Nucleic acid binder design. Structure first.
Lengths: 121, 87, 44, 50, 111
RNA sequence: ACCGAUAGUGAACCAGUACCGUGAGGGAAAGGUGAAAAGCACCCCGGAAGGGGAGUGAAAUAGAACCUGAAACCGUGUGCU
RNA sequence: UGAGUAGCGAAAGACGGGUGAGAAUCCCGUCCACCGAUUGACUAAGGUUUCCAGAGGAAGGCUCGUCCGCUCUGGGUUAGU
């Protein structure tokens, strides 16, 4: 691996799946410096599967994404697998990498760690 | 006689008035049969049944000195006719 | 780990109560010494 | 291993020569007008220009 | 002349307070405010309020301009200690000291 | 030709009280504004505690943690090194 | 003085929205996680108001706290079987 983030092997990969899913549902989250440095690889590799749009690519993405429901506006409820292959994948058909960005904020109270903003470009 | 001491007006007793149930504070050493015969001679009301319960002193401290409150005996009386007309 | 003290209301009154101290000649002397001392609690 | 002798206040002050903190390293933000951390956003308006 | 502000019996140890105080001595009024707002210490919010309250006195009780002000004095004293206890092993206990400090800030126009 | 708050009764304060023990039993620490409460109206910084003015008072570093206020110990600035 | 040193008492959390002067630690929602001959449901002894609602943040909580078995104000235990 790259870095362990003070977690066991089984529970580290479960946290990365939750972080990747949340960055698709809301497209903008705030978290720790170290965690966001490695969510880039997970999220950006997942959009690559979405652009291909194959059945083998869709089943290879269903083993990383969680099961949630999208409901923000008045339209029909949608999943997270459907959103990635239907909305995100159509905004990067002409882009080669660099689907995410990181912006630093500063140290937070009570912990001393710095928070950052990661979002889809 | 003067078995009854004070009436009780609380949030739970207000909804108990709709069922013709009145809450009074009684003497510590009396039974509900005595309380039954005390309402009928003061308000001239026919009663149906009487409930009663006992409490315990509460440790309340104000300032620097600790102490206890008085033990309380509370009775609930059910009326079939009339009304006590508490002001 | 079982400890030495296991409280019980009945035992505390039948061994150290007022009527137990009044039932023997040497128990009345205990109450007299505490009365002379001025204790707020004469017996358990 | 207990200390053998009492530590004088001359040794204690010498030891704390390097026990200190420094300034965060702030720079002026040419949108807000007040200082901000380098490579970070301006807390008053959230402008990480450039 | 000099204006001052004092805060008494703050639940912070005096040794930890003096770390931030040495970063503002002789600084500009705006520089001192900026330094205290960008450090992630425990005493930074507390000291800043004492400085901002000392500047308000210099602008109201006296006819000064708050653009040439400098920090002339900044020190922390100690106050009464709160003595607690903590149970250790083998049935004994150890003492715990909760210390307090008095924070003072002085701003001077100059002259 | 006895003590003057570590003294004098254990107890000058609501002390055989707190508290400790199953029980018999053991057993503390704590006095002081000012002559008079006249106990800071009002203005400024906060969420508050606190502080700076004004005012009462002979005195407010006598502001209720309040008569004087030593030492240990902890901080700031300076002449010589 | 030791010294800003040892320790902070078995363990899986992540993000969105609010409250707020101040939020990793408080509320609401989603996902993931742990026990399930028991960390689930009753009741005897023992404790004696720790139970409920509305307010508060000095001290207690081995951190923070807008929260609490903590403070203030009011309430709560109903038998011929």
């Amino acid at each position: 691996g790259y870095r362990k983030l003070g977690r066991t092997s089984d529970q580290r990969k479960a946290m990365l799946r939750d972080l990747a899913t949340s960055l698709i549902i809301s497209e903008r989250i705030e978290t720790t410096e170290a965690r966001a440095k490695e969510v880039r690889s997970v999220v950006e590799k997942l959009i690559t599967l979405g652009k291909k749009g194959d059945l083998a690519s869709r089943r290879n993405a269903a083993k990383t994404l969680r099961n949630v429901e999208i409901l923000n506006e008045d339209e029909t409820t949608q999943t997270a697998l459907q959103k990635l292959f239907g909305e995100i994948a159509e905004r990067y058909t002409e882009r080669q990498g660099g689907y995410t960005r990181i912006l630093k904020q500063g140290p937070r109270r009570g912990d001393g760690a710095e928070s950052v903003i990661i979002e889809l470009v | 006689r003067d078995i009854l001491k004070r009436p009780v007006i609380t949030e739970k007793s207000s909804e108990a008035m709709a069922e013709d149930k009145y809450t009074f504070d009684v003497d510590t050493r009396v039974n509900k049969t005595q309380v039954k015969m005390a309402v009928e001679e003061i308000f001239n009301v026919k009663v149906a049944s009487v409930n009663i319960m006992n409490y315990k002193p509460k440790k309340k401290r104000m300032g620097r000195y600790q102490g206890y409150t008085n033990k309380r005996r509370k009775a609930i009386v059910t009326l079939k006719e009339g009304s006590d007309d508490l002001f | 780990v079982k400890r030495t003290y296991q409280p019980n209301k009945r035992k505390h009154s039948k061994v150290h109560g007022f009527r137990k101290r009044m039932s023997t000649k040497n128990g009345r002397k205990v109450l007299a010494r505490r009365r002379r001392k001025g204790r707020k609690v004469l017996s358990a | 291993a207990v200390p053998k002798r009492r530590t004088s206040k001359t040794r204690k002050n010498k030891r704390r020569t390097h026990f200190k903190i420094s300034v965060p390293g702030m720079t002026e933000c040419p949108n807000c007008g007040e200082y901000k951390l380098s490579h970070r956003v301006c807390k008053n308006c959230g402008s990480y220009n450039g | 002349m000099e204006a001052k502000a004092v805060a008494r019996t703050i639940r912070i140890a005096p040794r930890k307070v003096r770390l931030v105080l040495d970063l503002i001595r002789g600084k500009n009024a705006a520089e001192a405010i900026a330094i205290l707002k960008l450090t992630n210490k425990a005493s930074s919010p507390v000291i800043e309020k004492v400085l901002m309250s000392a500047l308000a006195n210099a602008e109201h009780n006296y006819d000064m301009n708050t653009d040439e002000l400098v920090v002339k004095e900044a020190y922390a004293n100690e106050g009464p200690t709160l003595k607690r206890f903590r149970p250790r092993a083998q049935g004994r206990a150890s003492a715990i000291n909760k210390r307090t400090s008095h924070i003072t800030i002085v701003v001077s126009d100059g002259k």
